[PDB]
Structures are given as structure tokens and as C-alpha cells.
């Protein structure tokens, strides 16, 4: 999926801030060196106010949770796992 969920995000912001907000951190050590960026589609959601980050190549969808919270528009955040793999049965 390569898609991650974010929480505690200030909806309203465009798809640029968040977008450049997640990859700008992936470019730190230099996880990507091409004519473009890693994340590709990070649309936001209204209501409870949350966002998603779509990576068409970034191989951090698993560690991206590392930014869980980090700092966006001066406000804590909350990344989640939109995969729900292995449904604990019982």
C-alpha cells in the first residue's frame, strides 16, 4: 500500500505542506536522489481532521511511522497504520 495515516493534523492545509513535510524529512540523510520526491499523493481529510501520505516509491512506508507526531504547522501529529494486517481472531 505504501499509504500511511496521520492524525492531529490541521485539515485545510493543501497537499503541498504535508507532502513536502514528510519527504523533506526523508531527504535529510538522502533516502532519495532523483528528479522528484518520494511521497506522491498526500491528500488531507476533514471531519475528525486527518491526512494520508501516498508514496509511489519511498521505501519508508514502514519507518515513516517514525515521524509519528513529529511537528506539522506547529502542532503534534499522530501517524497510524492503515493496513490492519493479520486480524487478531478470537
Amino acid at each position: 500500500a505504501r499509504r500511511l495515516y496521520v492524525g492531529n493534523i490541521p485539515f485545510g492545509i493543501t497537499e503541498e505542506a504535508m507532502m513536502d513535510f514528510f519527504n523533506a524529512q526523508m531527504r535529510l540523510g538522502g533516502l532519495t536522489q532523483a528528479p522528484g520526491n518520494p511521497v506522491l499523493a498526500v491528500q488531507i481529510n476533514q471531519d475528525k481532521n486527518f491526512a494520508f501520505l501516498e508514496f509511489r516509491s519511498v521505501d519508508e512506508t514502514t519507518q515513516a511511522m517514525a515521524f509519528d507526531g513529529i511537528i506539522f504547522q506547529g502542532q503534534s501529529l499522530k501517524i497510524r497504520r492503515p493496513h490492519d494486517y493479520q486480524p487478531l481472531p478470537g
Side-chain angles (χ1 to χ4, degrees):
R2 305 105 223 208
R3 174 117 59 69
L4 279 171
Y5 163 101
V6 201
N8 288 253
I9 81 84
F11 159 90
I13 172 259
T14 65
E15 176 161 301
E16 288 164 286
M18 280 290 248
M19 183 174 282
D20 181 273
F21 173 53
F22 279 62
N23 45 64
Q25 296 304 292
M26 305 225 172
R27 275 286 305 286
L28 265 143
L31 308 172
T32 52
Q33 262 208 135
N37 356 93
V39 171
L40 188 76
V42 185
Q43 269 162 269
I44 303 89
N45 238 112
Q46 321 121 225
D47 297 324
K48 251 280 94 142
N49 319 308
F50 40 108
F52 266 98
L53 322 130
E54 197 171 6
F55 320 143
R56 231 218 146 209
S57 211
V58 98
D59 249 66
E60 201 146 48
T61 171
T62 199
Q63 320 175 292
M65 297 164 62
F67 312 116
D68 171 29
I70 194 184
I71 284 301
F72 189 63
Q73 200 173 138
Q75 179 82 291
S76 201
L77 316 171
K78 164 137 248 177
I79 291 214
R80 287 235 134 182
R81 286 213 255 149
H83 197 105
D84 46 76
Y85 89 129
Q86 284 179 333
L88 190 115

